[PDB]
Structures are given as structure tokens and as C-alpha cells.
């Protein structure tokens, strides 16, 4: 396919050019905070869906498979993007350029403070590792293709293509062969923790729905029905 014939340098440019925009928010009470985050996530999902089509090899799949992968990865992709924006803001989470919250501000929602700590620790990990934007777009596209694939052979061939581009980035940066696969392992192990934050964050939304803290959009509701 087209993604398979791409170059490691051409794969990176295709991912950087498809980067979704950083949206703005419309942070005191509980319902006002959950309202801003669910409103922000609903508008971000629209760009993510169009970002998904531009991910090389994602449009080659069938429509049902595109639905599946996006339904099981959308909160992971929303979070790793949030973790990336919050990188230059230690101790704070940059939901939107005008919506920057810290640890204690998350306490205004029942159970949100627990997800804040995991999100801040992830951004501290990206900061410690000095994650590059070219590596970030690779990790985000891996999540889109990997989080729903065990529920096929083309996806694993595209995933291997993204792995070569990741090694290509570290190789041209001066890291030795040992440093290359050691850093490669450190990035992919974060995807285990990002999956954990998504699951615990998925139950929080489902908890906010049953408590009816704030109305949820129909799109965000559909993405929440694919889980549980």
C-alpha cells in the first residue's frame, strides 16, 4: 500500500503534516470543570477522526475496522496529546492554551485528582526522556493501530513500518545501537501506562454519566458505549 512504500523521512513528514490543531476552551465548581473537559474532548474528536484518515495506512482499512480502532484508542490519543502539550508546563496540565490546570485544581471533581497524578507523571516522563515531536507523532499513530488490533496482518506491517521510522529518528540523532533499542523500549512501555490512564479515565466518564454531572454530546456518548 501507500504507507508501506513510504520513507522513514517521508513517514515522519506525513505524520507532522496531519497533526491536529490545539483547540481552545470556552475550572471552579465540579460541573463547570467536567463541562469544559467534555466540551473540549468532543471538539477534539472531530479533528482526531480526520487526523486518523491522514495517518498512513489507516484509510486502507475497512470502515468498520477504522471505527473499532478509533473507539478503543480515542481517550488514549486524547491523553497522550494532552501529556505532550503539558510537557513544557511541569506540575500543570495544558488541556487548552487558556485551560491550564494544576494538581489541586483537579480535586474539584470526584476522583479526577487520581487521573491528574498519572497524567502529570507521564508528562514528567516525556520531559525526563526529552521526547521529540517526531517521536510523539509516531507513538500516537502506534496507539491508533495497536490498541484495537487483538479484537490484521496489514496493521502489524504498518506498525513495523512505524517502528523503523522511530529507530530512524534516534539513529540520525547520534544514539548508539544500544541506546536506540533501550529508548525504543522506554517509549513503548509508556503506552502500557497510557492504556491504564485511558481505562481509569473511561470509568470516570461513565461515572460522571451515571451521576449526570454534565450532559455529554452524542458523539462522546457513542465513544463511551464502545467500552463496557
Amino acid at each position: 500500500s501507500l504507507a508501506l512504500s513510504l520513507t522513514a523521512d517521508q513517514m515522519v513528514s506525513a505524520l507532522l503534516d496531519a497533526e491536529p490543531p490545539i483547540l481552545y476552551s470556552e475550572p471552579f465548581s465540579e460541573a463547570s470543570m467536567m463541562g469544559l473537559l467534555t466540551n473540549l474532548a468532543d471538539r477534539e474528536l472531530v479533528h482526531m477522526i480526520n487526523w486518523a484518515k491522514r495517518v498512513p495506512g489507516f484509510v486502507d482499512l475497512t470502515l468498520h475496522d477504522q471505527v473499532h480502532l478509533l473507539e478503543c484508542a480515542w481517550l488514549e490519543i486524547l491523553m497522550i496529546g494532552l501529556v505532550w502539550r503539558s510537557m513544557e508546563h511541569p506540575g500543570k496540565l495544558l488541556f487548552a492554551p487558556n485551560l491550564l490546570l494544576d494538581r489541586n485544581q483537579g480535586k474539584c471533581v470526584e476522583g479526577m485528582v487520581e487521573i491528574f497524578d498519572m497524567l502529570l507523571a507521564t508528562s514528567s516522563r516525556f520531559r525526563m526522556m526529552n521526547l521529540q515531536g517526531e517521536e510523539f507523532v509516531c507513538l500516537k499513530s502506534i496507539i491508533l493501530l495497536n490498541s484495537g488490533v487483538y479484537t490484521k496482518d496489514h496493521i502489524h506491517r504498518v506498525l513495523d513500518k512505524i517502528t523503523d521510522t522511530l529507530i530512524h529518528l534516534m539513529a540520525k540523532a547520534g544514539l548508539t545501537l544500544q541506546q536506540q533499542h533501550q529508548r525504543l523500549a522506554q517509549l513503548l512501555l509508556i503506552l502500557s501506562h497510557i492504556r491504564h490512564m485511558s481505562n481509569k479515565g473511561m470509568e470516570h466518564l461513565y461515572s460522571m454519566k451515571c451521576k449526570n454531572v454534565v450532559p455529554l454530546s452524542d458523539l462522546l456518548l457513542e465513544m463511551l458505549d464502545a467500552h463496557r
Binding site: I49, N50, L63, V67, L219, E222, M223
Partner: peptide, 9 residues
């Protein structure tokens, strides 16, 4: 299925 509508523009 809103996701189906957005995937095909």
C-alpha cells in the same frame, strides 16, 4: 453512528 458519518466526511 456519528463516527461512521465523520469517517467518510
Amino acid at each position: 453512528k456519528i463516527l461512521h458519518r465523520l469517517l467518510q466526511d
